[PDB]
Symmetry: C3
Subunit: 341 residues, 3 copies
Amino acid sequence: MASIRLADLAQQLDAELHGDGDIVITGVASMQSAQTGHITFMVNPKYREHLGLCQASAVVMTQDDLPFAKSAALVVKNPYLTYARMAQILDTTPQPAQNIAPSAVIDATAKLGNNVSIGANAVIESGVELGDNVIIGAGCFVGKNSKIGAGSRLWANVTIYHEIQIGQNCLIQSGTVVGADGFGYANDRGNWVKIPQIGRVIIGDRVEIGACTTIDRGALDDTIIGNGVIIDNQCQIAHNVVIGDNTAVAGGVIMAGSLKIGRYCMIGGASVINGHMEICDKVTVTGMGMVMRPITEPGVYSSGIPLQPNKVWRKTAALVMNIDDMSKRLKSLERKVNQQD
Amino acid sequence: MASIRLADLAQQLDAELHGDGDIVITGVASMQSAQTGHITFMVNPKYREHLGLCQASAVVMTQDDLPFAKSAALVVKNPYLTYARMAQILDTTPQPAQNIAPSAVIDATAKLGNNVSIGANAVIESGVELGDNVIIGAGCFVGKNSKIGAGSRLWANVTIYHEIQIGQNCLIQSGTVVGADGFGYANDRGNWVKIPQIGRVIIGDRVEIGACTTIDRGALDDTIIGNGVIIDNQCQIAHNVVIGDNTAVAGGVIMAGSLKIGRYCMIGGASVINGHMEICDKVTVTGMGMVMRPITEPGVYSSGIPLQPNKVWRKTAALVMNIDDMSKRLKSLERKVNQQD
Amino acid sequence: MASIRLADLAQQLDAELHGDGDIVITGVASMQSAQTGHITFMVNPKYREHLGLCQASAVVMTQDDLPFAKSAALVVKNPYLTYARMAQILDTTPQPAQNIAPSAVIDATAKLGNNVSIGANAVIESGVELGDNVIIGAGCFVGKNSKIGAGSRLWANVTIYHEIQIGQNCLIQSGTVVGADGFGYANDRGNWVKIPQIGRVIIGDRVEIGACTTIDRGALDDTIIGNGVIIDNQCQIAHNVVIGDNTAVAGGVIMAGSLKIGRYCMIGGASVINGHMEICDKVTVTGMGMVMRPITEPGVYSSGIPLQPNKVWRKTAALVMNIDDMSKRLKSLERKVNQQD
């Protein structure tokens, strides 16, 4: 199962074979570390200088690169997208579980599709439904009445709370928490009153969520993750956030309550986003974005003063904090020269 | 559970029932998605315009809004507050556990109060004391000699280290880690030599801690969390941090060791706070605040520049760096003007 | 058994006996709270006055306090240091586990050295290797074929993925997740296509990793953490990041994919570091550093505008955002003078 032939792979990748079609390929690697049996690629500009010393058994390349080839070669229009596909074909990643661990704790009321795997010490609460081909990693928790769509996989130690819905073909990395009670509290004077959070989380199809990420459930209504959304490690998604289709949310993003984010957005790492607010389609937020105001026009947005050497920074911070006195000095000369000629 | 008559409820909420009083109510909903049997509420002012097509059976409402009643309305002086309680009254949220699960691993030494329930694959180590009504969720870990007070609930997959003390009626969401070792190092020729951390963590009554938060143990003395404090998701509370009664801490907040924060503070999401520093009572640090220096006076403090479209941003950020250029030029200009004529 | 005599201690600790040689020494404690049985120290130069109100059986000390010594004392060159040694040898800090628990799930093909401990409900996958004296905490997951060197300790609820290699004498706190898929996706018609992440994490010797940290696997080649590295809570280290020997990373730092940090660095809390970049040796970045360009010169680097009273900040923000206008107004008038002769 590990290995297939170059010709057979060319067929599946839709590439023109140019070397010997019977090379036995065992895996993908990078140009630098590739050994015999490995296939590689260069999206690379200029690294075709060094194909002669690359030890890979075949190299996915562009037609323009072919003159430079020094081994079997697969010619395509897009070498990077071909890489994605062939790494899937040759994926070494295990599954989080296989079959049902005798040590799993499965409520008698839970409903299981065909070909479902549940790992050791995983806990499945009452009324849970898991579709066909679902895989639940070891140590997972799946709260009451939750639903997990066919094809979806949880890695080890994921926490899904109750009344959560998860789409098809989703992937959730370890340590992640879905549907924790939202940060919402009443008040008299001083001390707080907890408002039960009876909303849910609805997660679309083909959603990928990274590790140690937290997705709070909504107050009354739902917090919603659209189809094909990708979210990296350690994001905070507040109650009632809505994230549109194919939005990418990088690592460490902090997103406040009732934020609506359009489709095709790119939110950069460590961005902090104000809540009860809206960000339109096709907005891009640079790394460390401070998003206080609603974004109503597409395009790319940014904030922050990048790093500088300490000696230099100290002056910069000090003048910034006195931009006021520096402002006024300016208007005083702007007046001294206006009237007095 | 099952519903209750609108009247029964109106008493327990201290409200004026203007309408049918035998209307049956099964839960709470939003105006937008209410149905027959649901009670919604409003002080959402301008939303009296759309009340007629709201499908809720009853609405919580001030008296100024009483003339727009197109349904059984309930009059109070604070609606959100009324909600907050009816919500408790009509709570659906399940319990993390019921009973002692056969699969939970409980040291013969541990002492349990009355009617504690402990989830599946939970692990209670020796010397641990759990109070009356305490609920330990699935996959939880409670370390040696740790005491959890009456009424406190941990959700699934919480990890409590050894010698940690938790007060009464506390709530802790999944993935949260309490009592890990903090930064503790001498330096033996290039490499960091660890110093054992033997303090512990003390959490007061009625504390709510969100998911994937980390609260480090003290070095010798303790990390202390005051009563009625709320800490949201993925906050980092370092060693020896002391947080006062009733303060609120939003998500992704980072507190260095030895920080003391007084009562009734409100720390904006994503703020980073220096260590070995005190912050007085009644201080607000707004979102993403950079807290470098001690705060000795109540009020609101803010930090950082907001978003700008990339085009603008780059110009601004270039200009902000070497303001020492602008500073000198202004100084050089006013030098020739005033002094010289 | 659990305690030893002063005279003996003073000898293993390398200090001069001044006072009683036989009191029972249960353990270390601070000045404010020490008691009979407790040995404390005093690194302060001034607290020497309050030495008399301590109630403790022994105090480590400099010869310059010896006179003001209110009870038995130990004289050394560096107190803080001998404090480390005191604590290093006196602590009752429990081991994450002791021997192998009945509920631990161990695959038949896993390899265990001498005296390894595994905690309750810990799951050890096929092909895994545990060196001598290794300790796996309660609820941990160790993935297929992973290697954990001798002396190494995982605390409760740590997730190690497949093909992860960890060195010797390392320490990983709870909640942490090692070797999760990096954020790698090809975009095909606005749809993200998942690139499998088939590299590993390699972690050296003497590494200490805090709680709720995420360390991602490489796409193809590896993520590498060098010897003697310390990384504290809530950190995100992306795929293919390479962190050289003895670097220190404080809480909740974010490292983008394919970043290279040289050895001996000190990266302050909440710093955010751009990917595909190099930071040379001996770089210190103060906290909330916004690092987007490579660092080629050793030294101390900073960014950020410190906190201001909100009233003052509103003003500072606005002027800064319109810094273009006042760069113009400056030149526009700088010209006027040198043009009006």
